[PDB]
């Protein structure tokens, strides 16, 4: 789970750098959690994967 289904946040790519300065490719994954989002106030909770940024920004609705 590295892509947000709302904003499309993909994982960034970079290097993990050691004390000896060996740089080894690693991934900054988004913090996306399984959220049972409620599209309409009705109540049917459809499961999706949303980044914590969207959860904090209120683009998810766990109604």
């Amino acid at each position: 789970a590295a892509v947000c289904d709302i904003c499309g946040k993909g994982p960034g790519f970079g290097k993990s750098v050691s004390h000896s300065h060996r740089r080894t490719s690693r991934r900054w994954n988004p913090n996306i959690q399984p959220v049972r989002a409620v599209t309409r106030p009705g109540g049917n909770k459809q499961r999706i994967n949303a980044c914590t940024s969207c959860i904090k920004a209120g683009k998810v609705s766990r109604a």
């Binding site: 409620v38 959860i55 904090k56 209120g58 998810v60 609705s61 766990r62 109604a63």
Partner: peptide, 11 residues
Amino acid sequence: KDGYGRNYLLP
């Protein structure tokens, strides 16, 4: 806090 509101109150 956001969790309380978003998951218990608004719902």
